[PDB]
Amino acid sequence: DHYNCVSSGGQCLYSACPIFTKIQGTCYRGKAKCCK
Numbered sequence: 001d002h003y004n005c006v007s008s009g010g011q012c013l014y015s016a017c018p019i020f021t022k023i024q025g026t027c028y029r030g031k032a033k034c035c036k
Helices: none
Strands: 011-013 033-035
Touching: none
Parallel strands: none
Antiparallel strands: 011 033
């Protein structure tokens, strides 16, 4: 039960998703965030 934001084309950083990218929801943990 996990979510991979890499297959959608977005990326998962370690800090809150930067405004330079869009929010694809959440990443593996709350400490990381997906971006696109």
